[PDB]
Amino acid sequence: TGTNSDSDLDSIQDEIKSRLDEIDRVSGQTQFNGVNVLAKDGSMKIQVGA
Amino acid sequence: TGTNSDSDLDSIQDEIKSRLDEIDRVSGQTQFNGVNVLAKDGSMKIQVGA
């Protein structure tokens, strides 16, 4: 919106940057049984057959 | 199954090695009247005819 001034844009940008960094944090931190599910692209095998 | 972590496989392999050693031990130990049945592949003949 063009109504907002430069200070308003900076105040918005600070919060967006905080949210973006929080996204990276939540991505990195979560892990299951010593394995981070979201860390790397890969394939996880579930051996469901006897 | 791939869910179990790397540390899990070490304990699993330790228990596996314990079981394998127990199998080898029971194979070697068992004997009948000074004769180890499972020590060597062999034949024993029972004399059932006069």
Q: Is the dihedral of CA A10, A16, A19, A24 positive or negative?
A: negative
Method: cryo-EM
Please judge whether B5 and A47 are an interchain contact, meaning their C-beta atoms are less than 8 angstroms apart: no
Query: Are the Cβ atoms of B6 and A34 closer than 8 angstroms?
Result: yes
Give the residue ranges of DSSP H helices in chain B.
Answer: 6-29
At A47, list the tokens. Answer: 């051996």
Which chain B residue shows the shortest CA-CA distance from A37? B3
Give Cα A50 distance to the centre of its chain.
38
SS3 per residue for A1-50: CCCCCHHHHHHHHHHHHHHHHHHHHHHHHCCECCECCCCCCCCCCCCCCC
DSSP-based three-state secondary structure for B21: helix
CA distance A23 to B4: 27
Q: Do B2 and A46 touch (CB under 8 A)?
A: yes
Contacts of B7 in chain A (CB under 8 A): 34
Dihedral in degrees, nearest 10, Cα atoms A23, A25, A31, A35: 110
| Whole-angstrom distance, CA of residue B15 vs CA of residue B12 | 5
